[PDB]
């Protein structure tokens, strides 16, 4: 199994006086930190969110972030003047790394303007997106003047991130392996006919996210299964909903095979009808 760190930023400038920057981090599927506009420190979300870092290490880091947020803000307002862009603006960053077995790691830092990719960090420098607008080339020019920022971003991605994600993995060890069994049941939705029925197979409360549901005729995979979106629960479990458009009654009698990981093999198969 693999657990990428993902640090997200959301920055929104309505006019040149009203603006907010909110952040958050995910280890794998679990959210581990968050950082809102009004708070001047970074909120931890798991007892083990500080990973393996000392309390003074964790401080000089929060300091780097604190100086970045404020400086990032002025710099955008100032690009707006130079590049002739009109408010409102919407910027997102997504930066992080992924530690691989046998000591290696890869990493990333992509930013997006009004919801489309515009640039990223590669090796030592900023680079434009394949097909980004003309002005983007000027922004890159101005970003690459700042030699100190470049080496800081580089140090953080190539060096600090990997060290932090290693700690988090052995310090949030038992939570990353936790397993939670689901409860499932069947029901009947709105008619898509006449004269045909709608079959719904609910699956609630499982964790981790990776799962597998289909509608079965014994051992026969009945495609035309429409699996919904895997939805979130407040307690960090997930909820699925798999449908089947059918002629009544062929079936009854049919089955829904749930293949989750705990359930170490002895999965749940339900038959039409029991409600």
């Amino acid at each position, epitope marked *: 199994r693999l657990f990428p760190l993902r640090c997200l930023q959301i920055s929104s400038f309505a006019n040149s006086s009203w603006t907010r920057t909110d952040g958050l981090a995910w280890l794998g599927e679990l959210q581990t930190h968050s950082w809102s506009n009004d708070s001047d420190t970074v909120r931890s979300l798991k007892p083990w969110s500080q990973g393996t870092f000392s309390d003074q290490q964790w401080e000089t880091l929060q300091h780097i972030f604190r100086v970045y947020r404020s400086s990032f803000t002025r710099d955008v307002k*100032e690009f707006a003047k130079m590049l002739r862009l009109s408010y409102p603006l919407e910027l997102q960053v997504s930066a992080g790394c992924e530690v691989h077995p046998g000591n290696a790691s890869n990493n990333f830092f992509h930013v997006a303007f009004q919801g489309k990719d515009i640039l990223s960090f590669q090796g030592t420098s900023w680079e434009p997106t394949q097909e980004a607008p003309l002005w983007v080339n000027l922004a890159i020019q101005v970003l690459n003047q700042d*030699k100190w920022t470049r080496e800081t971003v580089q140090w953080l991605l190539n060096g600090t991130c990997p060290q932090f994600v290693s700690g988090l993995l052995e310090s949030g060890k038992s939570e990353l392996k936790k397993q939670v069994k689901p409860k499932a049941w069947l029901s009947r939705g709105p008619s898509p006919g006449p004269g045909r029925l709608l079959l719904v197979c609910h699956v609630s409360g499982f964790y981790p996210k990776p799962v597998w549901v289909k509608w079965m005729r014994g051992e026969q995979e009945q495609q035309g299964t429409q699996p919904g979106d895997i939805l979130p629960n407040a307690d960090e479990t997930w909820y699925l909903r798999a449908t089947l458009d059918v002629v009544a009654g062929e079936a009854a009698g049919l089955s829904c095979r749930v293949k989750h990981s705990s359930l170490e093999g002895q999965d749940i198969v339900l038959y039409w009808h029991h409600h």
Partner: T-cell receptor, first 113, second 113 residues
Framework: ADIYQTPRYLVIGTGKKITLECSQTMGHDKMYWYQQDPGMELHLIHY???????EKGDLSSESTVSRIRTEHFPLTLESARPSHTSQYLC????????????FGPGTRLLVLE | NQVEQSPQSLIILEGKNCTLQ??????????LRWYKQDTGRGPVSLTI?????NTKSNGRYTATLDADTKQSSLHITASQLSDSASYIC?????????????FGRGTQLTVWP
């Protein structure tokens, strides 16, 4: 290739129209206008990132600038005033490893009744 | 004023050495520079340095930065009559054109024969 200002000095009646000329035959994109009352530090009144960008520093001055060619960045006062008396200094800057600023000879403006 | 200089003025005999002082509170600090302004003319940049520097040179002029205590100093060697001028200390808060510059009030140097 340097940076120039005309006129060196200027005496003018109040209420009339002043235009200080500044010219730059280096390649530079960025330029600034400073105002230096005597015995005081350089105060920044306008700057421009390049052609068509003209911004202000400070919330006060009643002067306007325009940038339509890279080489010209002229300062304008619509109706002169005693309060406008000062030295005015024009400058540009480049990169190619750190920034570097190049200043002009400046203009001595005196405004009378 | 986040940039402060000392002494206000001083007088030296020619051929003697001297040292001038600059103190700042600017944050973030990116870089700092010394400007020689002859009387009635425009400032001329002498040296620019960063924390990645600790020392710069340009003829008889040598500047040294201490980023920890937030202080720079300028040393002139074997002074000459042509050295008499106002020396201005200026600090920048970004390492790109995307930053403000802050101007000291400057020290007045007078060199006698």
């Amino acid at each position: 290739a340097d940076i120039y200002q005309t006129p060196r000095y200027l005496v003018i009646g109040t209420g009339k129209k002043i235009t200080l000329e500044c010219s730059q035959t280096m390649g530079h994109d960025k330029m600034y206008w400073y105002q230096q009352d005597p015995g005081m530090e350089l105060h920044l009144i306008h700057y421009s990132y390049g052609v068509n960008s003209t911004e202000k520093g400070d919330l006060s001055s009643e002067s306007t600038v325009s940038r339509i060619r890279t080489e010209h960045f002229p300062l304008t006062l619509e109706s002169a005033r005693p309060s406008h008396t000062s030295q005015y200094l024009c400058a540009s800057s480049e990169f190619g490893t750190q920034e570097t600023q190049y200043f002009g000879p400046g203009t001595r403006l005196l405004v009378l009744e | 004023n986040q940039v402060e200089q000392s002494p206000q003025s001083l007088i030296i005999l020619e051929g003697k050495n001297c040292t001038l002082q600059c103190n700042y509170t600017v944050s973030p600090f990116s870089n700092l520079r010394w400007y020689k302004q002859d009387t009635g003319r425009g400032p001329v940049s002498l040296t620019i340095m960063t924390f990645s520097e600790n020392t710069k040179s340009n003829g008889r002029y040598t500047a040294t930065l201490d980023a920890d205590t937030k202080q720079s100093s300028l040393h002139i060697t074997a002074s000459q009559l042509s050295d008499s001028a106002s020396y201005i200390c200026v600090v920048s808060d970004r390492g790109s054109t995307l930053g403000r510059l802050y101007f000291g009030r400057g020290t007045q140097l007078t060199v006698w024969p």
